[model samples]
Target: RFLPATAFIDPEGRNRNEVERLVQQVVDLILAKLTGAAERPPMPEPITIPEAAATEATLLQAIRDMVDGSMNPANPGYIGHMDPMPATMAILGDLVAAAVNNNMLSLEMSPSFSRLETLLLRAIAGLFGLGEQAGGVLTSGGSLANLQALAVARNVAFDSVEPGITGLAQRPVIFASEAAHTSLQKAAMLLGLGTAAVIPVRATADSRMDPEDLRARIDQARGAGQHPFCVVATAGTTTTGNIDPLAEIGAIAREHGLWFHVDAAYGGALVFSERHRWRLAGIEQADSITFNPQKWLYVAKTCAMVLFRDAGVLERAFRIPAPNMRATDGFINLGEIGVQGTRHADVVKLWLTLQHIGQQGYARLIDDGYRLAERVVEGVRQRPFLRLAGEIDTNIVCFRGEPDWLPAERWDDWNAALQALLLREGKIFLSLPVYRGGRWLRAVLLNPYTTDAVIDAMFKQIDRFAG
Candidate 1:
């Protein structure tokens, strides 16, 4: 056992110069790929797992092949999804966290990380205009954050902590925008509310939730004997990046005595953007909010936060005692509040990233993404073949290409084929999303490297392929 662990020891067991050399080699390779100065090699054939361990040299070669074969998000050409190009400092922070291997469940286990999480989350809540009682917890991803927020809403609304949903006389229903992320429905189903409990309120042509429709839906649910307890508004929808009317919807929620929650996983970063925070104007009234630093903040993967306007509500709604662990009031046991019990210290990377790139730096990045989307929108209007699917709210642009030669029904197929052709060329990548009964070519300009020149080249390819 000791022999097996010997090879995995820290810098103490390695030649420092050799380690640096290998790291620099991979760094240079990734940088070249990002700038388009070097072409990526074709993916190597899959290797079969061996019963015996490989030599160090063989393992090193495998690592090199894996890097070359991977879909490089570092490449400015890769704009398929909300996957962000992480800052180098964030990556280094991850390495440090891994070496330390702290668990975030208990304060005793991760004192520094827990306090960092608390302070950072409080500051984030301040940005959202949440008051002194506001506090939050860092989670693994946006899905978990959304789920936890709804969980708190459910427990608080029904006062069913011990009996859970069974204590309720009527089935609890959740109202969300038709443009909302699917995770809300998933949360409903997992909470035993059933999928039918999620009612999709109609969205406007611009994709914002229509408050009038929401009011009608709440009354409809009550008239139908369904309990309406929560209203979820999306700050940035996945397909169009449109922010729902938060102030309007929050008013509706308050008028009906429903818990208001904002799923701002994709657009919540706008709180830091002085120029764009107006898009999310009434988010402060939310009982709870889900924001993911991983998407827009360019942090490493699996860094999300769920903040409660009143911090004590978490314990009131979801607290479960652990007999074996310390239950002191002075030190928080984060596991008491959320679904996850034992979790990695994912907060370190986010903390490091925020400190490295201060508020001004983040604002500049957000503004750059907005500028890129504006440029692309202009480009789309100039081309007769392209039509905007929805209003561009954040950095996401959704459009459909209609070839002059193709029939109306064939627009979807033509756009899909265009995306496939671009993938085959391996220079630029974009995603196809279906919205409002039509397919759209969606581009997420979260990467700072996505410039006007890249946008022009991507459209030129579109024109070339369409011709």
Candidate 2:
């Protein structure tokens, strides 16, 4: 009755030694890549599966190779999208959660983890200024969070949780900015409202949703015999990182009796920054908010939440009987509120991250991002070939190279070529987003270590390519 070393349990501490050794090896490789000790290689060719067994050494080598073959967000040069380098402490917390393997379905299944999740989510709800009855559930990410929020909104507005959308007299409609995330439209489709039911309100010059346009659309929907049930506001748009008029939009939502949901997935981290918190002035008025700590809070991935102004709303909207869960008196089962079941203990990493950093630590990290963004803006302005797509609202900069010699028809080609060149060279990684009929290179300054010099260097490299 003998088995090779196993990490499932460590009675004699042999498994601990093996696991610790394996973990340290991975950490060293990651740290080396981040610190530029090794070249962060471009994407590798897809590997085929091996039919035969391999030694532990060979498997470890494969793991190392795999790590090298992927994009390294921990590298300061990685400025693409909202992906940020996570804190080391958060990663450790994730490991602890993984080892414990807690099922977040109910308190009986995960008493400590379930309680910790509720506590942390409530704290976040409070941060968003949700009142005494505030509550939320951790989700896989922003998309699911938005989906759940809209589902709750629809149920709460029409009392359709029981009878569902088919029972409604009028078809429900939702209003979002033209610049809103695709997830909103996807949510509409998933919620049985249909994509056509999602009406796009006009965006302002800087790409924020115009509150007046939203109001007009709501009226138009009502006139067309469609029930306008929800107004979706974006706190940070993808293309230009513009924030819609939250306070104004919230006022209109209240006036029209529509549920106001703010998709603050990208910019909700402002709540931590004392200097920039004012940008989200009217966020407190939102009926529900979708916030992703993984995006801006620099926690590990898949850590997001859909917060409600009132905790009881979720129970009223999404609760269904689960006799097997055996939820005892005074205990909350997470599945009673949200979409996921058999959820992992994702809250541990976020709880650890917030506790380690506190408010001031996060504020500094956010402020660093803002500072770097301003520097990039100034750098872009200094370069004659570079033109900004719009104003920078947060840490995102969307711009393109406009070479004098390049023909107008070749603008798209030039930007696309530049993006490919940079990626191939591996000096920096910036995402491409098409806006206003032009392809713009988008850089998100979410990596706190990406300094002013790094931003200047990236632009200077672009200028060289322009010449």
Candidate 3:
């Protein structure tokens, strides 16, 4: 969803406003069909499913249906995730990556691509306070990055092929806050450990993982004859925008010889921000840290970095050896230390983007994101019907609308429908969040173009419909 198809469409055929307008028209036409504003969008009557191939015309129609059906009015209002994007570098670099079609598994196959990826991993790892001992790989997103990080931790801790803290085999236990991303549980599944193996530690009042509670959990696991392996902390919780108490978690991990992995993909961009870096204090000490520039760093979709404190551990965890696959001459092959044998040149876009806009320019853009967040928060505060979900931190804001006429049921329904309607209208976008037993509207304002005036208009439309 973050890589909107419109973002990928070549600019040679259209400009920004033209693309936006065309997408708006398509949404309107599709919605008109759906809501009976015109005729039904179309019904294929199940004729195409059995046909092995759809003809050119049928394929075009199918594409139209797929795009139209998937269009989110909230796409404009889509602040629900870490960041929504204008995607300048993603587009440019994506074109070139596609043209090159580099499979960066080894320097023999993709020499330049492999080099760029190594550079990218080292650069990002350095930002997290990792040193030459650190190594990492780019993943599909933070979720996969997290999976790899935990998997590597498992290699270093339990020496197991499968993942999980389950005692069924060894009773290996891991610690993360209740607010940790669901990917933590997914890691358990991959490790062949039950989901129950990863224990949820309580968080402080601010929603950060409480280190004291974490210590108790570790002790409890150890007392039960379970091996405590890792402490997984959230850098930016999805719900409250709260940061976990990384400083304490780090000390605990160090004192106990546990792997400390921070899922910082969401708020990791804060490190680049002059004003917000304090929020993730001591993040540098993390044994492994994951971040997605596509989120707050605003690089592009599916661009995420998984960094490790020890380069040797990373290489060991992902090392695979085959006589046929080996290069006769001694050379560092990337596939030996990664989960994938064939991979896209995902780092090119990020590398090119960083080159295009130097650090000073990126710093200014980060400042813009912070200012935009503040302005949107203020706008939400000024509204009568809207209630802020929690303290606004970073660029995310969550709020629910309360209109006298609309009960909770209708409010929920309205938010859902309104998002679709606005997409058809094609001027704004929003995301939805469920808060305090009810659903709310959310926004992730990462677009530099998103100004206070635009945010105000978004509220006006929501209010008009809900009222």
Please provide the root mean square deviation of candidate 2 (C-alpha atoms, Å): 2.6
Candidate 2 colliding pairs: none
lDDT of 3 at 240: 61
Worst window of 10 by summed lDDT in candidate 2: 37-46
| lDDT, ranked from best to worst | 2, 1, 3
lDDT of 3: 0.70
TM-score of each: 0.92, 0.93, 0.78
Q: Rank candidates, TM-score, best first.
A: 2, 1, 3
- Candidate with top TM-score is 2
Better of 2 and 3 by TM-score: 2
Provide the RMSD of all predictions against the true structure, rounded to 1 decimal.
2.9, 2.6, 8.0
Alpha-carbon lDDT, every model:
0.84, 0.84, 0.70
Local lDDT at 442 for model 2: 90
**Tens-digit lDDT string for candidate 2 (1-467):** 44446424586775888777767877786667656623553233267775655556776788777776766776667787898777776787888998788889778778998888888888888888988888899999899999999999988888777788887778899999999999988888999998887899999778889888888999999998999989999998987788888999999999999999999998899999889988888899899999999998988887999999987888887776455453454558887778897898889999889989989999999888888888888988988888887787888888888888889789889999898777666467788888778888998998777777777778767876877
User: What lDDT does candidate 1 reach at residue 255?
Assistant: 93
Candidate 1, superposed: residue stretches over 4 Å from native: 1-6, 10-38, 41-51, 322-329
